[PDB]
Amino acid sequence: TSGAVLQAATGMYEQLKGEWNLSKCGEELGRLKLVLLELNFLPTTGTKLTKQQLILARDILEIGAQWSILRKDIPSFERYMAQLKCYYFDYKEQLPESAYMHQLLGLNLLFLLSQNRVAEFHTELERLPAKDIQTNVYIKHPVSLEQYLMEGSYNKVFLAKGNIPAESYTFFIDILLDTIRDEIAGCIEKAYEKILFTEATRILFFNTPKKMTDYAKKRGWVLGPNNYYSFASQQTTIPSTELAKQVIEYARQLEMIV
Amino acid sequence: DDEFEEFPAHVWEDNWDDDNVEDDFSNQLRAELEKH
Amino acid sequence: TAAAAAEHSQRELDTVTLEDIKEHVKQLEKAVSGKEPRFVLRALRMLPSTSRRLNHYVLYKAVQGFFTSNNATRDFLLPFLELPEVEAYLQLLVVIFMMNSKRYKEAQKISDDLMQKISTQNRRALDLVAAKCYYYHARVYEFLDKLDVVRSFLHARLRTATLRHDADGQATLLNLLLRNYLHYSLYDQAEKLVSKSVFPEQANNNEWARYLYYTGRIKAIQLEYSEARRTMTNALRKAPQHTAVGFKQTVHKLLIVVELLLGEIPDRLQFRQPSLKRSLMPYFLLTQAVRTGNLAKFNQVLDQFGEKFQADGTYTLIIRLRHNVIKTGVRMISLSYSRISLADIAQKLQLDSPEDAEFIVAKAIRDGVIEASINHEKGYVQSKEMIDIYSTREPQLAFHQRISFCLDIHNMSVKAMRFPP
Amino acid sequence: MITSAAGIISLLDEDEPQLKEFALHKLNAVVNDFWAEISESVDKIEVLYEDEGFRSRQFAALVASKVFYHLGAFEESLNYALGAGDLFNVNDNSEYVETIIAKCIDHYTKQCVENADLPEGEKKPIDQRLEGIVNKMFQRCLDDHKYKQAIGIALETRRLDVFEKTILESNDVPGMLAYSLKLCMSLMQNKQFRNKVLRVLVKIYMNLEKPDFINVCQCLIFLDDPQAVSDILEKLVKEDNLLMAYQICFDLYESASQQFLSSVIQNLRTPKDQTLKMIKILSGEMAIELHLQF
Amino acid sequence: DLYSRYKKLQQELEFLEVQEEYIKDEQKNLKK
Amino acid sequence: SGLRQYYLSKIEELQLIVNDKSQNLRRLQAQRNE
Amino acid sequence: VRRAAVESLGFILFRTPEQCPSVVSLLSESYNPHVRYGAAMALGICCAGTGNKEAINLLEPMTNDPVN
Amino acid sequence: YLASLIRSVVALHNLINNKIANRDAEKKEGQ
C-alpha cells in the first residue's frame, strides 16, 4: 500500500513537472496536497519514515510557493513558505541538502522586509547559519537591502532594484518600494517643518509628476496651507485629577495596616 | 549563593580620550598660529 | 606514609562534611517534619561548595551508612559509585558526583529516576529540590549535547509547576526552557513563551538574573533595544557579587553590544575591572572603532575576532552595529550642537551629500535617538530648545516611581517579620 | 523534531475540509509541547468550532480546550472542553484531563450551591454535558471501591440521590452511615441542606434489616419531627422491643427539648402499662430520680 | 478522611480571615 | 483510585493559604502587642 | 457591651474548643479590663468541662492582673 | 520621597533585627 501510494504521488509530481517543472498547476497542486495528507505532511518524529520525504515535501511545497509568487497571492506564499521552512530547518539529519532552497529562503526574507516585519526578519536571519549571510548571493541580497533600509541609504535601496540574483525576487521588490514610500512618509510627518511641492517630489520618489499628488490623496497630512504642499506640520494645564489620584495612593499605602 | 556554572568563564581611573591626535596641544596650536 | 597522613586529614575533613550533610538533613526535617514552609533553602544554600568538596570514597560510605529505610534502590547508586525530601537531596548529590566525574550515561539514567520520583510525589516542600534537580538534569543533557528531549520534558514539568501554584520550580523551569530555546536559536518560540508566561514577582535573585539575561537577549535580537538595555542592566545589578564570573561576562558583553546599537558608548570601568578585561577586550576594540566611526578599524576587528563573536553569539548584532555606528555619529553630533547645518553634518558624520544627510538624520529622529526638528527651506537641523524641567511634571513622575518603590519595600519588609510561636 | 508549529497552523487557513482535519490532528499531537505558538491562532479554531466543518465540532474544540488550558484562561477553557464531546476521554492519566475534571467539579459545585437557594422554577440550568462528566466521575468513584469521598463530593454538589446510592451500594453500611452522620452534624452549616441530608439518612436507617433506632431518634431530634418519633415508639411497642424503646426514650429525654418531648408524649397518648412507663421516662421522673440517687 | 481534612482546612481559613480583620480593627482603634 | 488527586489538590492549596495566613496573623499579633 | 461581646464569642465557639484560645489570646492582652474579663469568661464557657491546657495557660498569667 | 526612603531603611533594619533574633532563638533551641 505504501509503495503504491508513493508511486501515485510520484506520478502526480511527474505530471506537474511535465506541465511546467498556471491553473493546471493549480488543480495539480491541490490534488498533490491531498495526497500528501494521505502520506506524511510533517513526519513529526516518532514515525521516522526516513523515506527521504524531503524529496516530495520540497517538490510539492516549493512548486506551490513558486506558483504562488507567479500568481501574486501573499497568503498562499505565507502558507507554502511556512511549510517549507519547517521542512528545511527541522528534519536536518534525515533530509539531504537541497541546493534549491536558499532561493525560497531569501525570497521569504524579502517578503518580510516587504511587509515591514523587521522583528521576524532578524529572527529568521538568526535562525539561518552564520556563513550563509556573507557567502550566498540569494540571501546576501535581502540582507543587503535590509541593512541599507535600516541605515537610511534609501538611494542604495532603490539602486539595488536592478541587482537581483533571480527573477523570482519579484512583486516583493514592488511591495518593498511601497513600504519604503510609507517609511519615508513616517519620517516626513514625524520630524520636518514643511516641504514644498517640488521638494516633496524630489524626496519622495513618487510616480509621474501628475500622480505625484499620490500619498497626499492617500495619507493627507492635512496638506493645503499656502502652497498645497505646505505639509501642515504635524508637530500647560495642571493634571489635578491624576496628581490627586497619585497622592491619595501614597496616603492609602501609608495608612493601610500591613 | 550559587555560582552559575552553566555559563563558562594601570591604576588610573581612565575615561576614554585615548584618541589619535596630532599631539594633544602643541602642533595643533603651532599650525593655528601659523594660519592666524 | 605521607599519602596515608594526607588521606587521614582529608577523611577527618570528610567526617566534618558528613556532619554538614547531616545538619542540612536536620534542617530539611525542621521544614517538612516540622511541616513549616521554606528552610529547604536554608538546607540547600550550601549546595555549590558541598558539591565542590564531594568525594568518591566519602559517598561510597554514605550510600551504605545512610538511607535508614533501605528501600533497595540504593543499588542503583552503589554499583556505579563502586524520607520524602532527603532522598531527593541525596540523589541530587549523587548526580552531582557523576557530573563532576564525567560519567554522563548513568548520570542521565539516575537523573531520570530522580525525576520520576519527584514527579510522582506531589509534595509542596519538595518543589525546591525539584527545581535543583531540573537544573542539574538539564546540565547533564547539556554536557551530552542533546538539549532536545529536555525541551518537551522540562516543558511538561513547567506545566505541572504552574498548575501547582509554585514559584521556585516555575521560575527555574521557565529559565532552563528559555536556555534550550536560545541554544537552538529559536528566537520566535522563545519570544512567544516569554510573552505568554508571567515570571514570579517573588522569585530568587539568581533566577531573576538569568531570566533578565535571556529576556534582554530576546528583545535585543527582536529589535527592542531600549527595553533590551534596561533588562540587561537590571540583570547585571541583580547578579551575584563575589561569583558567577562567566555570567557577568556574558551579560556585560551583550550589554556593550546593545548599548552600541542604541547609539551610546559604554562605561570604561567595565573594561577596567580585572575579572573581565581579557573577556571583553574584543569589545574594547569594537567600541573604539564605533566611537571613532572608523569603518576600516571596525572591519579589522571583525576579521580579527569574529570567531569569538560567533561563539558568544553576537554576530548579527555586530552588523546591526554598522547601522547604529552611523547612528552613533549622528547622536554625538546632535548631542553637542543646536542648529548644525546639513552641509556641515555631511562631514562630521562622514556622508556624501546634504540629501543623504536629510535622509539619515530624518531616520535618526524617527528612531528617536537625537530628538530634534529639521528645516530644509534653508537647510538646518535645529534641535529642541531645552525647557527647564522643574516647572514640569517630570520631577513629579520620577519621584512618583521612586516613592512607589520605597513604599513597596517598606510593605515587603514589615511583611516577612515572621515570629516563631 | 518540529522546531515550529506555524507550518501546521498554516493549514487551517486552507479552504480544504480534507486538509483541515490533518492539521488539527497534528496540532493536538503537539499542543503539549508548542502551546504558546498556537495561542494567537486560537481565534481561528474558535470560529472553526462554531461552524459545522465536518469534525470541526468536536476535535477542534478539544484542541481549543488544550490551548486555553496551557495559557491559563480556565473559565473559557471549560466552555470548550465540555463541547469537546466524547473525545474528552474522561479515563486517562493526562494532566490536562485531571485538571479540566477538577475545574468541572468546581464549576458544577458552584452552580449547584448558587441555584439551590433559588426557587424551584427560576434556577440557572446546568450544562447537561458537564453533568454527564461529573456523573461519570462519580460512577468511577464507586467503581474504584473508593466509596468514601463520593459522600463528600456529593454533599458538596448538593445532589442527594447519589448520596443515597453511594452509601447504600458499599461495604460497611453502618460505618458509612456513622461517617456521614458525623459530617452532617459537625461540618455542614446550611440548615436546610442538613435537614435534607438527615432525612435521607433516616430513610436509609429505616430501610435496614436490623434497624438502628438510636441514631434514628437522634436524627429526628435534629429534624424537629416529634410525630415520626411517636409513631416509631408505638411501632416498637406493638412489635415488642421494650429495651430498645426504653433506650430511645432515655436518649430522647437527655437530648430533645421540652416542646419536642411534650409533642412526643401528646402524640403517644392520642399493654398500656408500657405506654405509661415510656411517658414517665420521657416526662423525666425516672431520669431525675436516678440522677438524684446517684 | 480526605473530605474531613478538606473541610477542616476550609473552616480554618475563614476563621483566620476573621482574626485578621479583627486585629486590623483593634490596631486602628489602638492608634487612636 | 477515586478523586484522591482532586481532594489533594484542593487540600494542598488550602494548606498553603492557612500556613502563610498563620505567619501573617502572628506578625499582626506582635505589632498589636507593642 | 464590649465585655458582653467577648462573652457571646465564647458562647459561639464551644463545639470547637481548640479554637477559642486562638480568638481569646489576642483579646486577653488588651488594655481594657472589661475586655480582659470578657476574654476570661469566654474561655470559661468555651472550654467548660474540657480542661484545655491552652486555655489554662492563657488564664494563669491573668490571675496576677492589677484589676480585681 | 526622602521620608519614604528613610522609612524603607528603618523597616529593613527592623526586619534584619527580627531575623537575627529568630535565628538566635532557633540556634539556641537546637543546642
UniProtKB/Swiss-Prot annotation, chain A:
Cross-link (Glycyl lysine isopeptide (Lys-Gly) (interchain with G-Cter in SUMO2)): 210
GO BP, sorted A to Z: proteasome-mediated ubiquitin-dependent protein catabolic process
Top-level taxon of the source organism: Eukaryota
Keywords: Isopeptide bond, Phosphoprotein, Proteasome, Ubl conjugation
Gene Ontology cellular-component terms listed: cytosol; nucleoplasm; nucleus; proteasome accessory complex; proteasome complex; proteasome regulatory particle; proteasome regulatory particle, lid subcomplex
All residue ranges annotated as the PCI domain in the record: 75-239
Quaternary organization: Component of the 19S proteasome regulatory particle complex. The 26S proteasome consists of a 20S core particle (CP) and two 19S regulatory subunits (RP). The regulatory particle is made of a lid composed of 9 subunits including PSMD8, a base containing 6 ATPases and few additional components. Interacts with DDI2. Interacts with TASOR.
Role noted for this protein: Component of the 26S proteasome, a multiprotein complex involved in the ATP-dependent degradation of ubiquitinated proteins. This complex plays a key role in the maintenance of protein homeostasis by removing misfolded or damaged proteins, which could impair cellular functions, and by removing proteins whose functions are no longer required. Therefore, the proteasome participates in numerous cellular processes, including cell cycle progression, apoptosis, or DNA damage repair.
Family in the record: Belongs to the proteasome subunit S14 family.
Name the record gives this protein: 26S proteasome non-ATPase regulatory subunit 8
Covered residues, full protein: 83 to 350 of 350
Swiss-Prot record, chain C:
GO biological process, one term: proteasome-mediated ubiquitin-dependent protein catabolic process
Cellular component GO terms, alphabetical: cytosol; extracellular exosome; extracellular region; ficolin-1-rich granule lumen; membrane; nucleoplasm; nucleus; proteasome accessory complex
Disulfide bond entries: none
Swiss-Prot/TrEMBL keywords: Isopeptide bond, Phosphoprotein, Proteasome, Ubl conjugation
Modified residues (Phosphoserine): 341, 353
GO molecular function per UniProt: enzyme regulator activity
All copies of domain PCI, residue ranges: 209-388
Source domain of life: Eukaryota
Oligomer and partners: Component of the 19S proteasome regulatory particle complex. The 26S proteasome consists of a 20S core particle (CP) and two 19S regulatory subunits (RP). The regulatory particle is made of a lid composed of 9 subunits including PSMD3, a base containing 6 ATPases and few additional components. Interacts with UBQLN1 (via ubiquitin-like domain). Interacts with ERCC6.
Family recorded in the similarity comment: Belongs to the proteasome subunit S3 family.
General function of this protein: Component of the 26S proteasome, a multiprotein complex involved in the ATP-dependent degradation of ubiquitinated proteins. This complex plays a key role in the maintenance of protein homeostasis by removing misfolded or damaged proteins, which could impair cellular functions, and by removing proteins whose functions are no longer required. Therefore, the proteasome participates in numerous cellular processes, including cell cycle progression, apoptosis, or DNA damage repair.
Species of the source: Homo sapiens (Human)
From Swiss-Prot, chain D:
Post-translational modification N-acetylmethionine, affected residues: 1
Domain of life according to the entry: Eukaryota
Subunit details: Component of the 19S proteasome regulatory particle complex. The 26S proteasome consists of a 20S core particle (CP) and two 19S regulatory subunits (RP). The regulatory particle is made of a lid composed of 9 subunits, a base containing 6 ATPases and few additional components including PSMD1. Interacts with ADRM1. Interacts with ZFAND1.
Family that this chain belongs to: Belongs to the proteasome subunit S1 family.
Its job: Component of the 26S proteasome, a multiprotein complex involved in the ATP-dependent degradation of ubiquitinated proteins. This complex plays a key role in the maintenance of protein homeostasis by removing misfolded or damaged proteins, which could impair cellular functions, and by removing proteins whose functions are no longer required. Therefore, the proteasome participates in numerous cellular processes, including cell cycle progression, apoptosis, or DNA damage repair.
UniProt name for this protein: 26S proteasome non-ATPase regulatory subunit 1
Organism of derivation: Homo sapiens (Human)
Shown part of the complete sequence: 1 to 341 of 953
From Swiss-Prot, chain E:
UniProt subcellular location: Cytoplasm; Nucleus
Superkingdom of source: Eukaryota
Subunit structure: Component of the 19S proteasome regulatory particle complex. The 26S proteasome consists of a 20S core particle (CP) and two 19S regulatory subunits (RP). The regulatory particle is made of a lid composed of 9 subunits, a base containing 6 ATPases including PSMC4 and few additional components. Interacts with NR1I3. Interacts with PAAF1. Interacts with TRIM5. Interacts with ZFAND1.
Membership in a protein family: Belongs to the AAA ATPase family.
Record's function text: Component of the 26S proteasome, a multiprotein complex involved in the ATP-dependent degradation of ubiquitinated proteins. This complex plays a key role in the maintenance of protein homeostasis by removing misfolded or damaged proteins, which could impair cellular functions, and by removing proteins whose functions are no longer required. Therefore, the proteasome participates in numerous cellular processes, including cell cycle progression, apoptosis, or DNA damage repair.
Protein name per Swiss-Prot or TrEMBL: 26S proteasome regulatory subunit 6B
Naturally occurring in which organism (per UniProt): Homo sapiens (Human)
Residues of the full protein shown: 39 to 70 of 418
